[PDB]
């Protein structure tokens, strides 16, 4: 019992993205819908390999949203370039100052700007969209950020500025290489690696310092 051919706009046979156990997302076909216990499960046959039975927060539509349809806090899958499809949260919507991109805070802590054609809406997000973020530090951060929005204290940094930036519990000598909207590209001077970090993050010493006085 409990088999369904549709659940609103989720129709058996549609194209879909599904979350694999690797936490990367892959294209496939929605092959079944079933009510099991408190909710529905969605069976996905992936194009490349495999089948999965997934909750509604672990499938995404195979289309890009009209930008207008997404908000800060929206649950999305986005192209994670360091390319994979990975889940995250919309932290900022398109504006001229961000070159009309979405800022994504990914589930592992990564941040990037993506274009409108690089994200996919999760089909049935949780009402509090951060509640399915596995990493508790990430989960807590997103709840704080979304709840506080649009109050976003940020540090004004300039290319060439020297600051300490936190990473793995250590505060490292670092240099500001570039500013891009709400992100700064930080060069870690000891190891020579760059990281794009949110300008409101307390990993940046000036933000840490302010929050610690403040609280």
């Amino acid at each position: 019992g409990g088999e369904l051919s549709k659940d609103g706009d989720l129709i058996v046979s549609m194209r879909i993205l599904g979350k694999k156990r690797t936490k990367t997302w892959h294209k496939g076909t929605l092959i079944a819908i079933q009510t099991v216990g408190p909710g529905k499960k969605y069976k996905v046959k992936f194009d490349n390999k495999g089948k999965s039975l997934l909750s509604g927060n672990h499938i995404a539509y195979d289309y890009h949203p009209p930008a207008d349809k997404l908000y800060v806090g929206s649950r999305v899958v986005a192209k994670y370039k360091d390319v994979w499809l990975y889940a995250g949260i919309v932290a900022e919507t398109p504006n001229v100052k961000n070159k009309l991109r979405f800022l994504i805070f990914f589930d592992d802590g990564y941040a990037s700007y993506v274009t409108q054609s690089e994200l996919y809406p999760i089909c049935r997000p949780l009402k509090k969209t951060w509640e399915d973020i596995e990493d508790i530090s990430c989960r807590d951060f997103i709840e704080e950020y979304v709840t506080a929005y649009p109050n976003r204290p940020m540090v004004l940094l300039k290319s060439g500025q020297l600051i300490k930036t936190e990473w793995e519990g250590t505060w490292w000598k670092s240099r500001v290489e570039e500013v891009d909207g709400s992100l700064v590209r930080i060069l870690f001077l000891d190891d020579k690696r760059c990281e794009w970090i949110y300008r409101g993050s307390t990993r940046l010493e000036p933000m840490f310092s302010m929050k610690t006085s403040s609280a």
């Binding site: 592992d108 530090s137 990473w167 307390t202």
Partner: peptide, 9 residues
């Protein structure tokens, strides 16, 4: 690689 959004606890 990523250090996430807040310092390590």
């Amino acid at each position: 690689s990523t250090g996430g959004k807040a310092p390590r606890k």
